[PDB]
Design a protein around this ligand. Structure first.
Ligand SMILES: O=C1CCC(=O)N(O)C/C=C/CCNC(=O)CCC(=O)N(O)CCCCCNC(=O)CCC(=O)N(O)CCCCCN1
Ligand SMILES: [Fe+3]
Ligand code: NA
Ligand code: NA
Ligand SMILES: [Zn+2]
Ligand SMILES: [Zn+2]
Ligand SMILES: [Zn+2]
Ligand SMILES: [Zn+2]
Length: 279
């Protein structure tokens, strides 16, 4: 049998079976976590559709098969020694019959803690610590670069276009919020702090958008055509941030994510976009 993880008790983490310390064949069924596992040098043999559509992550998991959580046959034949899932997955019991499962309830640990937590689970503390120390220094330095341009108290709102809907996001639901609010310590407008932050996200009617945007807005979308009718509208064009050219449009295919690999890309992209807003 496998050498075992110490399986620490961590908020949000549930273990099904004996988790290996050094898994050799991991199936990741939760896009939140795939890039954390890659950062810690795990061999991923299965990943999700969102993972494959994230160009930053996809480059690192070319040999992994795309699978869904219902793919019991394909997952079995991948011969995993570990499966990682989100806690809301429909069929964790069936997955745990195939291999040991780590199930994570989102948001119980923050985007940085998740990495050091995996460091404890897999005895990869050094790799996690090195990344986290560098991240702390780099983000503080970049925070200075961007606030030099905007002012330290400029407000930012995180937004996404999805289907025909409009979402706002807080500090810990992807779409750039970790970078903008946690890494750069930008404030959000009061209405976003009150109505969005605790909730994580808020699906909004388009006509009230002006009320939620202050100095800057970051907008994630999967395709560059989705926002067209909104963007040309008098409503949108009346927003001071829009008039100032403080709209930052980003590609959701990577910006949905919160993992170290995706966030490295988001960090550089957002730094450059803020600087570019004053070109
Ligand atoms: O984990 C993150 C950031 C936070 C996040 O989006 N999560 O889903 C984490 C798990 C949240 C707890 C379970 N909640 C839900 O499943 C509710 C639906 C959901 O995924 N949400 O994010 C809620 C707001 C978005 C709803 C519309 N769906 C999308 O934007 C698809 C991309 C979308 O939201 N996805 O999750 C697929 C890509 C995600 C890449 C990893 N990103
Ligand atoms: Fe989500
Ligand atoms: Na933080
Ligand atoms: Na999608
Ligand atoms: Zn700060
Ligand atoms: Zn039109
Ligand atoms: Zn203009
Ligand atoms: Zn400006």
């Amino acid at each position: 049998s496998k050498s075992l993880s110490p399986m620490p008790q961590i908020a949000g983490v549930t273990y099904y079976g004996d988790i290996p310390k050094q898994p050799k064949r991991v199936v990741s069924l939760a896009s939140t976590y795939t890039g954390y596992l890659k950062k810690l040098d795990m061999n991923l043999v299965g990943v999700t559709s969102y993972d494959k559509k994230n160009p930053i992550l996809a480059k690192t998991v070319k040999k992994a098969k795309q699978v869904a959580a219902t793919d019991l046959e394909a997952i079995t034949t991948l011969k995993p020694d570990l499966i990682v899932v989100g806690s809301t997955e429909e069929n964790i019991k069936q997955l745990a019959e195939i291999a040991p499962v780590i199930s994570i309830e989102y948001r119980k640990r923050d985007y940085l803690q998740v990495l050091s937590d995996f460091g404890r689970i897999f005895n990869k503390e050094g790799k996690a610590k090195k990344w986290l120390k560098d991240w702390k220094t780099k983000t503080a330095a970049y925070e200075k670069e961007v606030k030099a341009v905007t002012g330290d108290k400029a407000t930012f709102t995180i937004m996404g276009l999805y289907e025909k809907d409009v979402y706002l996001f807080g500090k810990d639901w992807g779409r750039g919020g970790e970078i903008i609010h946690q890494a750069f310590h930008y404030d959000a407008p009061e209405k976003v702090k009150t109505e969005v932050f605790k909730q994580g996200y808020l699906s909004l009617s388009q006509e009230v958008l002006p009320d939620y945007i202050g100095d800057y807005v970051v907008i994630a979308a999967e395709d560059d055509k989705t926002g067209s009718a909104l963007y040309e509208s008098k409503l949108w064009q009346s927003i001071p941030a829009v008039k100032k050219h403080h709209v930052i449009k980003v590609n959701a295919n990577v910006f949905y994510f919160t993992d170290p690999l995706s966030l490295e890309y988001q960090l550089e992209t957002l730094r450059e976009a803020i600087l570019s807003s004053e070109n």
